């Protein structure tokens, strides 16, 4: 939800938070018994029962609305 509530530039923050969550799951799995991180991630993204998850839909929405008509490319710095 936090990723969906911010622009596309929050993708790095989302990736970092997902890595933190994966680390926490790995730490907790030593004693407890939880599902694989992939299963939880897909259930949260609703990608288990749908071809496309929430992340890709939000990326497409941002590309359509906020990215293309607001960002100007610079070939020197890419």
């Amino acid at each position: 939800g936090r990723f969906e509530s911010e622009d596309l530039t929050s993708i790095v923050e989302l990736d970092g938070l997902l890595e933190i969550n994966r680390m926490t799951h790995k730490l907790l799995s030593r004693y407890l018994t939880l599902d694989g991180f992939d299963a939880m991630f897909r259930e949260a993204n609703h990608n288990v029962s749908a071809p496309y998850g929430r992340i890709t839909l939000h990326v497409f929405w941002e590309l359509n609305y906020d990215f293309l008509p607001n960002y100007c490319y610079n070939g020197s710095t890419n």
């Binding site: 599902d35 609703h46 749908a50 071809p51 839909l57």
Partner: protein
């Protein structure tokens, strides 16, 4: 102990039936049969895992 283990045996047998059914279903999939509907992607009910707490 016998009662609880017998309940566990019922659960194991039921899930074994489920597992063999799932395997025979999965061994029939076809990549070309797969069709992706962009419109139905969110019109589809989302799957949620059980969250029962004792």
């Amino acid at each position: 102990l016998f009662n609880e283990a017998h309940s566990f045996s019922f659960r194991v047998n039921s899930l074994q039936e489920r597992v063999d059914r799932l395997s025979v279903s999965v061994t029939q999939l076809d990549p070309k049969e797969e069709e992706l509907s962009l419109q139905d992607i969110t019109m589809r009910k989302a799957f949620r895992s059980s969250t029962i707490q004792d």
